[PDB]
Write a protein that binds this ligand. Structure first.
Ligand SMILES: CC/C(=C(\c1ccc(O)cc1)c1ccc(OCCN(C)C)cc1)c1ccccc1
Ligand SMILES: CC/C(=C(\c1ccc(O)cc1)c1ccc(OCCN(C)C)cc1)c1ccccc1
Ligand SMILES: CC/C(=C(\c1ccc(O)cc1)c1ccc(OCCN(C)C)cc1)c1ccccc1
Ligand SMILES: CC/C(=C(\c1ccc(O)cc1)c1ccc(OCCN(C)C)cc1)c1ccccc1
Ligand SMILES: CC/C(=C(\c1ccc(O)cc1)c1ccc(OCCN(C)C)cc1)c1ccccc1
Ligand SMILES: CC/C(=C(\c1ccc(O)cc1)c1ccc(OCCN(C)C)cc1)c1ccccc1
Ligand SMILES: CC/C(=C(\c1ccc(O)cc1)c1ccc(OCCN(C)C)cc1)c1ccccc1
Ligand SMILES: CC/C(=C(\c1ccc(O)cc1)c1ccc(OCCN(C)C)cc1)c1ccccc1
Ligand SMILES: CCCCCCCCCC(=O)N(CCO)C[C@@H](O)[C@@H](O)[C@@H](O)[C@@H](O)CO
Ligand SMILES: CCCCCCCCCC(=O)N(CCO)C[C@@H](O)[C@@H](O)[C@@H](O)[C@@H](O)CO
Ligand SMILES: CCCCCCCCCC(=O)N(CCO)C[C@@H](O)[C@@H](O)[C@@H](O)[C@@H](O)CO
Ligand SMILES: CCCCCCCCCC(=O)N(CCO)C[C@@H](O)[C@@H](O)[C@@H](O)[C@@H](O)CO
Ligand SMILES: CCCCCCCCCC(=O)N(CCO)C[C@@H](O)[C@@H](O)[C@@H](O)[C@@H](O)CO
Ligand SMILES: CCCCCCCCCC(=O)N(CCO)C[C@@H](O)[C@@H](O)[C@@H](O)[C@@H](O)CO
Ligand SMILES: CCCCCCCCCC(=O)N(CCO)C[C@@H](O)[C@@H](O)[C@@H](O)[C@@H](O)CO
Ligand SMILES: CCCCCCCCCC(=O)N(CCO)C[C@@H](O)[C@@H](O)[C@@H](O)[C@@H](O)CO
Ligand code: NA
Ligand code: NA
Ligand code: NA
Lengths: 271, 271, 271, 271
């Protein structure tokens, strides 16, 4: 239709992208000003109305996108669904979830990631890298669970604040893995009651700092490669062979050309 | 035999793998519930029986594997031997080892690594990467030993809690390497008695944080390459030339093709 | 002109570079001696005159460069503009800027980077790598802003020293990201009032340490590649195809040569 | 000569290498036992004689090497000179150096690095990687010097324990860079007197943690490549083109073969 065509042209324009970006920045700025308790009643009401105006602009934005692209076409993108969920949750009356309150309107600033394409590409690369590290993340989970059960049984009765139950142990083991007061704060006091506690905590530190770094490097390397390959696919329109596949078959390809070259030499020498 | 053939088909099936996985998860869950001291006598007896049921299911599992594959064939795999050692140690009466107690039944959760193939491949890659870093791990050991002897002689008499003997010094040097209260907790108090102690501790920190990162990066890079190469070997059935070998001979291979190409050009120009 | 030609030859000489380097080192040494409060009035006046002599040598240096290369030619280089700004700011009477004082004459030691070419190349590579990580740096900024607004609203009234306003929260969140007393100093005291505060702080730590490492690795890898490629461009005089571009088209290039090779074989077999 | 030939064969043998290794291990073990103050007078005299026996075995070892290889040939290797310096310093009466005492006989354990070839190769790779990072190490030195001068002038009078002079400031800035109590221990107390001190310390942390990681990654990547290339050179006897040189010319080489291939196709189509 003619109506949907001119709306899509407006939506896809750089100025529309800039308008939405400016309103996200403004909404973030007013929410940051609203953290200040010393403000007057009128100053607070003024910022609250600017928050309402920002929200209504986003409702118009999303509605234009659903009309212009269609319900199936809009919800086809995970980025648009994210944008829809962020805006539509603000107008949701009494939600049945295990949450304290929906006071976190500042999560609307996270739309800068979805609206700005350079930021969208960076986050996309990271998200695409996550399934590939699932096994490493599960190994860390297994180590934490085993260690938390052991720490609860070994030290729960003598150090109940740090290890009195499974929740307490998982928390202090996270603290131990981050190396935060692990010795002066946790393990030297524990060793005053349990002298060989270093046998538990030093291998736990060695294994978890290793695994976390492995997980992080795994995500970083993959995200960087995925992003680089997606940019090339976007530039040329052709499918990009992943680098690992190029490196794995590099030897196979070179020797095959060496063979085809030597047989062409064989056909050449005798003519 | 017909009996061993249908048992191997059952063992190798995805449902059998899922049954074993569910029982490991269940056993881990009941052991985690057993860390809670507030439970009733009957609640504890109930979970203890679920632990017994889980163990008996693993005894059947392993026995089916020894019968179906043979004693030589089963113990041919390091993964099956690990599975055997984890389950068989629970039925071992009075073991002669330098251990406090075999209360750590939670180590059974480590079977999730051996049973889940994606997790098995990740750990396998890491294990295969370890011999290759042996020299770096030995260099760190040498630095720790030298430093612990020096720290004991220099500071043992004035700081006996931290350096009074070799064990105490190795422990606080591990703490110093992890950067945990190294200055406010250890070196500023030491410098009040020994003003030039920074000459010992700052180079020790520089060398050990460097070496640890070197060891960790070495393992991560190798494990990632080993895993990638093993997957390709499993997919195609052909031996995968290691990437380092492809990169080392890349120059040699390209110039050899350049030479074979130029001589084919030489045979072509004059005919 | 003959005057500008002999001045440029003098400027470009290794001895002129060594003279300037020696004066920067000397100026840095006298400023370091001037930090000592126990010095006599005459000792202080003596060093202050050596600081004046060093500054006057730099005024001559820069003036020779503007005359020899021309106003347009000198200010064409970002390195020369930096050198000009560092020296010319010392002779600036009453500047209108949001600064306490221009006592930081020690920033003149930063000229060692611009004057020594090996150091200039290293910093240049790093600077050229910065625009490419802009999106990651902006993602970290967004996470810090969102988290600081949340932390101010959640914990400002009960923990005003750490979260009483946006500035206070950004500061303690930076401290939390660096893992400095995050648990014993900040989150365990906060959890005594807000028991589920770990839900906020543990994901904040996981996301920001990850993003910072991503930003740092991104800069390091790019700077290393940019430097390596610029050296090759300087050595040969030919434009260096970036490594990513060589790796992305490696597969495309190899199969194209395989195809050209097979058709040459096809023309050869039938003659 | 016949005497030097049979001595070199003995020196180069695996058993001779194993004898020397065993004596280094033994010497290290006795020095570690000598750190214990509770030992008897006779127990101490016994270990001291085993230290003397170990030293005399090393004097024989080195003397056999100088005779068998020649003064010029032995001192041609940096590894042999290191071995000579470590052993010969023990027999040096009254040395004129800025040292407290030559009690550090435990540095003899560092010979495990020189005697064991796998360990020698690892350290060699690291040492060869150091000149290449000289510029990054100098940039960190410049940042530390500038920051130490600034910190001394800004905070020396109000925080003299941490910044009272240049030495004190360099020490606490090293502590700040390692993130050790940087905020709770140093910067929050400083900000109580100087509210904008975060403007100095947060950029200092960002720049130095970045530079240190850059220096460390630079050494790790280079050492790994140098080692891999030296092994290949040792295996084949042929000079190994560095990987960076192979990667820089990969594009140049591939297009040159594409060109030589297309002209061979041109000579083929028309015959
Ligand atoms: C092609 C990108 C890619 C991987 C990749 C990216 C960059 C790179 O340098 C190398 C590979 C990839 C492939 C396999 C992989 O395996 C890890 C094990 N998983 C299955 C638990 C991880 C990433 C991938 C990611 C998710 C699903 C499928 C493929
Ligand atoms: C040696 C090149 C390499 C990989 C590689 C090895 C052989 C091969 O034929 C192709 C590539 C590499 C790159 C990515 C990779 O991703 C898997 C990530 N996991 C942790 C999810 C694995 C190996 C690599 C490893 C670690 C960091 C950076 C690069
Ligand atoms: C082929 C895999 C491999 C190595 C490798 C893997 C990935 C990669 O990118 C490069 C190499 C390997 C080879 C040599 C090596 O030497 C270190 C020194 N050791 C002997 C102390 C380490 C790993 C290896 C591992 C153990 C034994 C033999 C070979
Ligand atoms: C530059 C590519 C490279 C290596 C390489 C260099 C030259 C060559 O011809 C082939 C590969 C590299 C990769 C692995 C490696 O493993 C040894 C691990 N040690 C620490 C056990 C060494 C170099 C590399 C080095 C560090 C991290 C990631 C990659
Ligand atoms: C050619 C160097 C380069 C990049 C590069 C360097 C080394 C390397 O191994 C790979 C690439 C480069 C290219 C793209 C890039 O994208 C990140 C996203 N930005 C746009 C936010 C970053 C660096 C680059 C840097 C700035 C502008 C343009 C190009
Ligand atoms: C796997 C090789 C690789 C990159 C690569 C992947 C595919 C390809 O065709 C070419 C190169 C790589 C290198 C640099 C890079 O820079 C982007 C930096 N961002 C974070 C600004 C991206 C990928 C890489 C990734 C992480 C660390 C080191 C190397
Ligand atoms: C060939 C090894 C090498 C370098 C290298 C090693 C591995 C790798 O992946 C890439 C290069 C090398 C080359 C240049 C370099 O420049 C840094 C700047 N210096 C001059 C301050 C560093 C290392 C080198 C080291 C010292 C002197 C000369 C060359
Ligand atoms: C992208 C491949 C690469 C380098 C590279 C880029 C282009 C090229 O043609 C060849 C190689 C790389 C490798 C080593 C290197 O060493 C310099 C070390 N400095 C810090 C002393 C520089 C770039 C690299 C960069 C960082 C980590 C691992 C690998
Ligand atoms: C990795 C996931 C980690 C999840 C950790 C368990 C959930 C949080 C548990 C918790 O907050 N408790 C309150 C204790 O004060 C214990 C509960 O079991 C009851 O409420
Ligand atoms: C991948 C690792 C993931 C670690 C996840 C940790 C979650 C456990 C934290 C939690 O749910 N708590 C109950 C919340 O009610 C525990 C904390 O409250 C407790 O540990 C202490 O902070 C003190 O309150 C008691 O000393
Ligand atoms: C890197 C391996 C580190 C091993 C460290 C030595 C073993 C543990 C020593 C220890 O616990 N002692 C008890 C001291 O309280 C000292 C013993 O020698 C006696 O029992
Ligand atoms: C690669 C690095 C590996 C470091 C290994 C450290 C092991 C040494 C620990 C040990 O065996 N102890 C004896 C156990 O009885 C020492 C601890 O007990 C002691 O250091 C303190 O914690 C206090 O108890 C005394 O102040
Ligand atoms: C990432 C950029 C972080 C910038 C942080 C805000 C600027 C510094 C704010 C500050 O120092 N204040 C003084 C409070 O003592 C608050 C002001 O708003 C008034 O002066
Ligand atoms: C990318 C992350 C960037 C973080 C940037 C932090 C800047 C905020 C610091 C600031 O401007 N302050 C006001 C300066 O007047 C705050 C500090 O003063 C305050 O947080 C405390 O240090 C105490 O003074 C109060 O308890
Ligand atoms: C990066 C190299 C760092 C070198 C640091 C200076 C040398 C040590 C200075 C020192 O120990 N002093 C004693 C102060 O107690 C100050 C001296 O100047 C006098 O002895
Ligand atoms: C690349 C970074 C290199 C940092 C190098 C630091 C060397 C400076 C240490 C030094 O020489 N001191 C004098 C030694 O006499 C200083 C210490 O003594 C002093 O800072 C404190 O520890 C206290 O003694 C006073 O509060
Ligand atoms: Na740390
Ligand atoms: Na810390
Ligand atoms: Na820390």
């Amino acid at each position: 239709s003619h109506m949907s065509r001119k709306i899509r042209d407006l939506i896809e324009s750089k100025r529309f992208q800039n308008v939405i970006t400016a309103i996200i920045v403004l909404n973030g700025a007013v929410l940051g000003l609203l953290t200040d308790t010393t403000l007057s009643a009128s100053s607070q009401n003024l910022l609250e109305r600017v928050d309402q105006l920002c929200l209504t602009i986003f409702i118009v934005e999303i509605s234009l996108k659903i009309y212009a692209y269609g319900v199936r076409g809009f919800f086809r993108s995970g980025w648009n669904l994210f944008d829809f969920v962020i805006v539509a949750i603000a107008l949701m009356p009494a939600q049945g979830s295990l949450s304290v309150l929906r006071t976190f309107r500042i999560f609307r600033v996270m739309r800068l990631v979805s609206v700005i394409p350079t930021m969208r590409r960076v986050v996309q690369g990271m998200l695409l890298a996550l399934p590939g590290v699932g096994s490493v993340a599960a190994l860390l989970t297994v180590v934490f669970y085993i260690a938390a059960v052991m720490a609860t049984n070994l030290y729960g009765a003598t150090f109940p604040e740090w290890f009195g139950d499974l929740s307490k142990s998982l928390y202090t083991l996270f603290q131990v893995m981050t190396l935060e007061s692990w010795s002066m704060g946790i393990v030297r006091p524990v060793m005053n009651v349990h002298p060989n506690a270093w046998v538990f905590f030093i291998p736990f530190i060695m294994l978890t700092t290793f695994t976390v770094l492995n997980l992080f490097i795994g995500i970083i390397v993959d995200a960087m490669a995925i992003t680089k390959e997606q940019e090339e696919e976007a530039k040329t329109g052709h499918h990009q062979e992943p680098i690992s596949q190029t490196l794995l078959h590099l030897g196979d390809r070179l020797d095959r050309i060496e063979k085809q070259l030597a047989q062409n030499n064989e056909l050449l020498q005798r003519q």
